[PDB]
């Protein structure tokens, strides 16, 4: 399957411009950073919870592993 045999497309016009006739990095930060921030905005509620969740359980489980390796309770305990 290649150009000519892909599919049937009707009544569409594509305008484009030579790479030498146009700017390589148009409105880079101008239009970029906002689009980036909207993009981050969009997905973050879907992405982050699982990882925050990991962050809680990690540190919890580690500090917790550290408690259990420390000394037991000490007001006269190995005797009395």
């Amino acid at each position: 399957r290649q150009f000519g045999h892909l599919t049937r497309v009707r009544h569409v016009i594509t305008y484009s411009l030579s790479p030498f006739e146009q700017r390589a990095f148009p409105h880079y930060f101008s239009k970029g950073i906002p689009n980036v921030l909207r993009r981050t905005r969009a997905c973050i509620l879907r992405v982050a919870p699982p990882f925050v969740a990991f962050y809680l359980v990690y540190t919890w489980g580690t500090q917790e592993f550290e408690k259990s390796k420390r000394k037991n309770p000490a007001a006269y305990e190995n005797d009395r």
Binding site: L17, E21, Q22, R23
Partner: protein, 73 residues
């Protein structure tokens, strides 16, 4: 009609030097091309340096080690 079809405005993305729709492009093209072909040329120089360096290393891998040379004396 097919003549209602007017090309959209690319002055948003254009290169400064070709913004004036009453000024001939033929000047700037000289610089415009050169500029972009430069990026390529440099990239190629850096790449060449890079390659040169890891090739010869991998090659040197195969000449006698300081181990073999120790006895060479």
């Amino acid at each position: 009609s097919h003549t209602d079809i007017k090309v959209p405005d690319f002055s948003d993305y254009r290169r400064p030097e070709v913004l004036d729709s009453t000024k001939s492009s033929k000047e700037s093209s000289e610089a415009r091309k050169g500029f972009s072909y430069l990026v390529t040329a440099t990239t190629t120089v850096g790449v060449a340096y890079a390659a040169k360096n890891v090739v010869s290393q991998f090659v040197s891998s195969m000449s006698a080690s300081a181990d073999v040379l120790a006895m060479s004396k």
